[PDB]
């Protein structure tokens, strides 16, 4: 009986959880009872960083307490810093779900490579949600938005908050908690999030506008230690690796359906929804593209130019 303990950032009653659980079941039935996945809450392990620690050992040849994990870009990069995975979060680089679906598919090897060399197999990729800006006032232009004080939740642990502040944004570090107090206090104009959070938590009350134009994906992030994967026999591999690829796909669909209903509820609730003009979308990309350099000095690597252009060459040709 081969049992795979996998750490997960998937939120509780969430549909990423439902889907991981369906995969553990789909895998179990493929292997006739052989393989199952037991999931462990990443917050309980004390963060992705801490979780990576539980993948190692203690000693070589001795089994890690953990045979895998679902990491966000944060955990991914701590595991393989030559990866260049944060490259997909480049604003307006990939804005579309089909477009990102195109990338995770065709560029797979180029993505998997850094991680295979850290001794991991990437079972599948998927998306945490699409960044949006929730704000108390509107913005007729980008620089107008960079001028607004905008709080991040993780922030200092997440490199994309530090490089946002490098693009000219005023980004203030706040816990999920001091958000409602800070807004009414006028200490913040708004915050970065995903539609799901902003609806589910009920923070929509406290802001007047929400951005519906897709900017860039938060990618995750499921890997199993090379050593634990070798414990499953031979045969089943192909079969179960396709099962997870299937997952990415239902996930892509439902995340979309979900992001859509959320952006609906917030509508009905009196928030007004902002939609970027095809013009502006072009116009903004070029304002960020100009923001490259001061990143590479503060966060070298972090962008793989090869990988940049494989991606560019596809989506726009």
């Amino acid at each position: 009986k081969v049992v795979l303990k996998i750490a997960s950032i998937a939120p509780a009653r969430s549909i990423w959880e439902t889907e991981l659980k369906k995969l553990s079941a789909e895998w179990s039935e493929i292997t006739g009872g052989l393989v199952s996945m037991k999931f462990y809450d990443m917050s309980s392990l004390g963060g992705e960083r801490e979780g990576i620690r539980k993948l190692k050992s203690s000693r070589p040849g001795q089994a890690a307490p953990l045979d895998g994990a679902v990491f966000s870009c944060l955990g991914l990069s701590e595991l393989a810093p030559d990866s260049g995975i944060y490259t997909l979060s480049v604003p307006f680089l990939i804005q579309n779900e089909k477009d990102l679906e195109r990338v995770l598919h065709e560029l797979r090897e180029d993505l998997d490579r850094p991680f295979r060399a850290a001794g991991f197999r990437v079972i599948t990729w998927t998306n945490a949600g699409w960044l949006s800006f929730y704000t108390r006032a509107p913005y007729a232009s980008l620089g107008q938005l960079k001028k607004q004080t905008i709080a991040l939740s993780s922030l200092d642990s997440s490199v994309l908050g530090t490089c946002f502040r490098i693009c000219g944004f005023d980004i203030k570090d706040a816990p999920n908690v001091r958000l409602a107090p800070l807004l009414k206090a006028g200490s913040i104009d708004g915050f970065l999030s995903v539609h799901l959070f902003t609806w589910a938590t009920g923070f929509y009350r406290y802001i007047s506008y929400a951005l519906d134009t897709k900017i860039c994906p938060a990618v995750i992030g499921m890997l199993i230690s090379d050593g634990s994967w070798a414990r499953i026999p031979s045969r089943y591999h192909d079969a179960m690796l396709q099962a997870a690829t299937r997952v990415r796909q239902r996930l892509a669909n439902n995340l979309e359906t979900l992001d859509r209903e959320c952006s609906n509820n917030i509508q009905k609730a009196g928030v007004s929804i902002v939609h970027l003009t095809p013009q502006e979308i072009q116009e903004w990309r070029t304002e960020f593209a100009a923001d490259v350099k001061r990143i590479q000095a503060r966060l070298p690597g972090m962008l793989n130019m090869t990988l940049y252009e494989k991606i560019k060459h596809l989506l726009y040709s």
Binding site: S14, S36, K54
Partner: protein
């Protein structure tokens, strides 16, 4: 009538109970629909559903193999529905006593809500626990998208409100439900661990040493997310240490809790590294 639930609470044979309750739910429910304005009946049938949902639906589904999870998802959806029906039956007791109450409470206006709950007396505490607990249980079975933010917060307010009126009620039963909630919900949601440990100390004030529940609640809600394996084991041990024969009263809830503790002890593996 209440001499009647005695033959259930005191029973140690689970199957006898599992097989005989459904028609009882059906009978109470019928009586209710006949005399809707009768508040005792309202609460009775609501509490019954909430209790059955937990013991005979949701619980059995937790003991299910992980590959069978479709069946388990059906069970959870079933239990959710039943928790909700219960909560409404209990809520009608409140709406009968304070007309407009349902409208005000779910209005989702912090003032209108602080008003209607202030109308409540110790009489209504029983009803508040069950309405609150009903909704809170359903939330635990509700998919992140579909959870409905004003609603949840109403339930939790109702519980914190019974706490104001009657902190000792049912040996701190309300504290137990809150502990479980606070520990689960993010602080964005109104939860958090500081809030949860606090609610638990209060449980200890009024709870029985012969009750297995708080010990379980401790290991389950607190110990796990804090990755404390020690206290987890020790607490489940304290629970399994109680002789069900030494508190004839509540014998059923004890047997059930001890069943759950044993399962937890065996699955410790799945809760820790």
């Amino acid at each position: 009538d209440a001499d009647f639930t005695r033959v259930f609470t005191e029973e140690d044979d689970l199957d006898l109970v599992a097989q005989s309750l459904p028609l009882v739910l059906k009978v109470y429910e019928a009586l209710h629909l006949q005399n809707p304005a009768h508040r005792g009946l309202s609460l009775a049938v609501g509490r019954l559903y909430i209790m059955y949902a937990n013991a005979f639906v949701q619980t059995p589904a937790q003991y299910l193999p992980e590959d069978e999870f479709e069946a388990q998802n059906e069970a959870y959806s079933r239990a959710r529905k039943l928790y909700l029906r219960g909560a409404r039956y209990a809520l009608s007791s409140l709406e009968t006593a304070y007309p407009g109450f349902t409208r005000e409470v779910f209005s989702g206006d912090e003032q209108r809500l602080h008003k209607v709950l202030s109308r409540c007396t110790r009489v209504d505490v029983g009803t508040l626990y069950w309405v609150g607990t009903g909704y809170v249980a359903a939330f635990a079975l509700t998919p992140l998208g579909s959870a409905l933010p004003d609603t949840v917060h109403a339930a939790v307010m109702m519980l914190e409100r019974a706490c104001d009126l009657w902190p000792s009620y049912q040996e701190g039963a309300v504290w137990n439900v809150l502990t479980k909630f606070y520990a689960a919900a993010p602080e964005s949601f109104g939860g958090g661990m500081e809030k949860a440990h606090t609610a638990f100390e209060h449980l200890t004030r009024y709870c029985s040493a012969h009750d297995p529940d708080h010990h379980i609640t401790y290991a389950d809600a607190l110990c796990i997310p804090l990755n404390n394996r020690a206290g987890f084991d020790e607490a489940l041990d304290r629970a399994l240490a109680i002789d069900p024969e030494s508190v004839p009263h509540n014998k059923l809830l004890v047997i059930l809790s001890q069943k759950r503790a044993r399962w937890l002890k065996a699955h410790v593996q799945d809760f820790f590294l």
